[PDB]
Copies of this chain bind each other. A is one copy, B any other.
Amino acid sequence: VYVAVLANIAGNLPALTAALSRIEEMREEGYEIEKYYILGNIVGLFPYPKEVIEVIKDLTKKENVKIIRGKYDQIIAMSDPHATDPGYIDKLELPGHVKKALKFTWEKLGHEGREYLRDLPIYLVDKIGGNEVFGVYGSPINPFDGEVLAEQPTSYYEAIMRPVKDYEMLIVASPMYPVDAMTRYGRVVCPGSVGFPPGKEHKATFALVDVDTLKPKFIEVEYDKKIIEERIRAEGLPEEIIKILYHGGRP
């Protein structure tokens, strides 16, 4: 019995599709999936924002699913609901290629898609087994702009867990790699990144968390970067997004 924990889809439909199909295969292999946690970014740099949302909505009907929004989702959601274009984004402190990806996302979502992100919770507060879990995109101190690093010593995660020590587990998206850090205050976990490559040769990465022990099993799944590349060019988006696709980046 496990909870499937996914993060940072970032508008990448092929990676999301590959992760969920792998989860279905693993069900056939004796892994019982009680429920799903999906952490932002939900939409972002990659050009399938409406399709990602459709897949999540179907899953939310069929399964027990809890979702929280990430930094890119918030940039879209915070906009005036009556705005006629995504011009407000150019004022923000962001790289040029990121502004263009988010303006594209804003337009392609329409009013219904923007509204869906506005309904997304910031915080995940849940129980698995007898254990209480707290989830946030960035860090406890700063939900959208906070950054928890991967590959740090136990003391690092202990200091982060301390202000949320009421909980048995903290889940964050911002490390972008698998994190599994037992501390005196609880366990800090990052499932990895489904659709936002942090480096080269990225595989869609997520975790199955054991409901009894809270130990994560990290899973990696290949997806086709070819159709994504061809979809970016066909929508007229910066060449820098293709670089991130094959070389990595930080949101």
Contact = CB atoms under 8 A, between A and B. Distances in A.
Contacts of A122: 140-141, 163-164
A249 interface: no
What is the copy number of this chain in the assembly? 2
A118 B120 CA distance: 30
Interface string A156-173: 000000111110000000
A87 interface: no
A74 interface: yes
A166 B121 contact: yes
Nearest to A81: B159
A123 interface: yes
Interface string A73-96: 010010000000000000000000
Interface in A119-134: 119-123, 125, 134
Contacts of A163: 69, 77, 118, 120-122
A152 interface: no
A177 interface: no
> 6 closest A-B pairs (Cβ-Cβ)?
A122-B163, A122-B140, A125-B125, A121-B166, A118-B162, A121-B163
